[PDB]
Paper text:
At the first stage of this study, we replaced circularly permuted EGFP (cpEGFP)—the fluorescent core of GCaMP6s—with circularly permuted BrUSLEE. Since the permutation procedure in the original GCaMP6s involves the deletion of a 4-amino-acid fragment (corresponding to positions 145–148 in the parental protein), and, thus, the removal of the 145th amino acid residue, which is an important structural determinant of the fluorescent properties of BrUSLEE, we engineered two variants of the construct, with (GCaMP6s-BrUS) and without (GCaMP6s-BrUS-145) the M145 residue. Four calcium ions are tightly bound in CaM domains at the corresponding binding sites, confirming the holo-form of the indicator.
In contrast, the GCaMP6s-BrUS-145 variant exhibited a pronounced calcium-dependent change in its mean lifetime over a wide range. In contrast, the GCaMP6s-BrUS-145 variant was found to be extremely dim, showing only 10.5% of GCaMP6s’ brightness. The mean lifetime of GCaMP6s-BrUS-145 exhibited a well-defined dependence on calcium concentration: as the calcium concentration increases from 17 to 350 nM (1–7 mM [CaEGTA]), it decreases from approximately 2.4 ns to 0.8 ns. The most remarkable differences were observed in the following regions: the mobile linker 314(-/M)LPDQL319, together with the part of the first α-helix of the CaM domain, where the distance between the correspondent Cα atoms reaches 4.4 Å and the last Ca-binding site at residues 428–443 (2.4 Å)—other minor discrepancy was found in the 320–324 region. It is noteworthy that the shortening of the 314–319 linker led to a significant and simultaneous shift of this linker as well as the C-lobe of the CaM domain and M13 helix compared to the GCaMP6s-BrUS structure, reflecting the increased rigidity of the shortened linker. Compared to GCaMP6s-BrUS, the resolution of GCaMP6s-BrUS-145 is higher, allowing the visualization of extra two solvent molecules in the vicinity of the chromophore. These molecules mediate the hydrogen bonding of the OH-atom of the tyrosine moiety of the chromophore with the side-chain of S129 as well as the main chain oxygens of E72 and H90 and the main chain nitrogen of V127. In contrast, in the GCaMP6s-BrUS-145 structure, the guanidine group of the corresponding R388 is turned to the opposite side in the direction of the mobile linker 315LPDQL319 and forms the solvent-mediated hydrogen bond with the side chain oxygen of Y392 and the main chain nitrogen of S129. Such changes in the conformation of R389 (R388) may influence the solvent accessibility of the chromophore, potentially controlling the degree of solvent-based fluorescence quenching. For example, GCaMP6s-BrUS-145 has the largest fluorescence lifetime contrast between the so-called Apo and Sat forms of the indicator described so far (both in relative and absolute terms).
Numbering used by the authors: 47 to 155, 170 to 233, 237 to 460
Write the structure that this text describes.
């Protein structure tokens, strides 16, 4: 009864959420910058806020070769990055342990500098920072293995306490370790600039707060890949998320079997032929039943956003990965309102039973005019017989 309702809901909410993810740009987007003989990159990072929503950090980036040698200017593509932050239980100093996995994708189905990345390469990181006049240094060390896009670093704040959250420095503190697939080796700018290296420059805008400006030199010093950085931060709020340390350090590396099974149920609403992959046709069917009407091109681009193997379809594991990440890094209010907007057909700020029934039956759920009410009940905080925004928020967690 309650069970069925709760279950029928998760499936819908998850499907809507999947469309939200597929309509978003969460990767690192790289483009050639012929005028500078380099590349540009653009992306955003989500920083979960302790007991709250999410902090956005909008990154603009340029990389320029230090040397005169030829480099590879890529076609447009992306890097997909997975990071984990941890603490060294024996470390007394303010520190961060970082693991990253970085892979290039985005282009559907080898430079001299790449030979320097065939095995495990030692890394040294040095940063000097100044944020609102609060100065600091970080040293880090570790190793990278481009064969797997793997890197592991440990950083120490050598000046005492870091005056900003460690997660805000992850992107600043070696994309040369990215795994490029065989068909995309001609688009690896980073390794092509080695050993002489490149300059990596960023402006990072933390929404509703200040911005970082960074300049780094990434180059070999003997056998070690070194990342030397300068960071300047201005316009930060003294009691904002950054200077006020209001950001979460790490997420459970967890995700229960029950959450995974919920993802699988949602997957199966898109994979209508049961073949274990989602096609543009399947994707378009679901979107249209939700009242959208994307073109073929939009459908291919939505799939391409999460298509790890470049086959043109969202395979079962690609979808699982995408959902896991959508649940770990929180949504903006604008994104939750878009999702709400799918159900709220008249746009009055209230999901009626008639609206919900419309959405469900459109998605091809066989539900009773009683199961429909049963669903509203579960979500209805204030007992008005409808679902408002704050109530939707709850229904989506
Ligand atoms: Ca299928
Ligand atoms: Ca695929
Ligand atoms: Ca409405
Ligand atoms: Ca209500
Ligand atoms: Na603001």
């Amino acid at each position: 009864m309650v069970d069925s309702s709760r279950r029928k809901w998760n499936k819908t909410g998850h499907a809507v959420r999947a469309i939200g993810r597929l309509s978003s740009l969460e990767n690192v987007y790289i483009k050639a910058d012929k005028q500078k003989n380099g590349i540009k990159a653009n992306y955003h990072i989500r920083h979960n806020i302790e007991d709250g929503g999410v902090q956005l950090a909008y990154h603009y980036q340029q990389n320029t070769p230090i040397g005169d040698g030829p480099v590879l200017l890529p076609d447009n593509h992306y890097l997909s990055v997975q990071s984990k932050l941890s603490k060294d239980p024996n470390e007394k100093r303010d520190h961060m342990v970082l693991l990253e996995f970085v892979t290039a994708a985005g282009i559907t189905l080898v430079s001299k500098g790449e030979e320097l990345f065939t095995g495990v390469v030692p890394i040294l990181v040095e940063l000097d920072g100044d944020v609102n006049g609060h100065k600091f240094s970080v040293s880090g060390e570790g190793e990278g293995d481009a064969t797997y896009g793997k890197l592991t670093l440990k950083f120490i704040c050598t000046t005492g306490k870091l005056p900003v959250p460690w997660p805000t420095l992850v992107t600043t503190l070696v994309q040369c370790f990215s795994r490029y697939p065989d068909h995309m080796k001609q688009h690896d700018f980073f390794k092509s600039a080695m050993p002489e290296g490149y300059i990596q420059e960023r402006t990072i805008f933390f929404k509703d707060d200040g911005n970082y400006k960074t300049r780094a030199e990434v180059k070999f010093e003997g056998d070690t890949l070194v990342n030397r950085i300068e960071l300047k931060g201005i316009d930060f709020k003294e009691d904002g998320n950054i200077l006020g340390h209001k950001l979460e350090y790490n997420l459970p590396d967890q995700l229960t079997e029950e959450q995974i099974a919920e993802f699988k149920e949602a997957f199966s609403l898109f994979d209508k032929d049961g073949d274990g992959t989602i096609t543009t046709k399947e994707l378009g069917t679901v979107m249209r039943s939700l009242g959208q009407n994307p073109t073929e091109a939009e459908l291919q681009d939505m799939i391409n956003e999460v298509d790890a193997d470049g086959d043109g379809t969202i395979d079962f594991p690609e979808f699982l990965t995408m959902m896991a990440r959508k649940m770990k890094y929180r949504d903006t209010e604008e994104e939750i309102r878009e999702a709400f907007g799918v159900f709220d057909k008249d746009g009055n700020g209230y999901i009626s039973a008639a609206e919900l029934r419309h959405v469900m039956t459109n998605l091809g759920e066989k539900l009773t005019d009683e199961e429909v009410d049963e669903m509203i009940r579960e979500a209805d905080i204030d007992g008005d017989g409808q679902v408002n925004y704050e109530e939707f928020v709850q229904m989506m967690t």
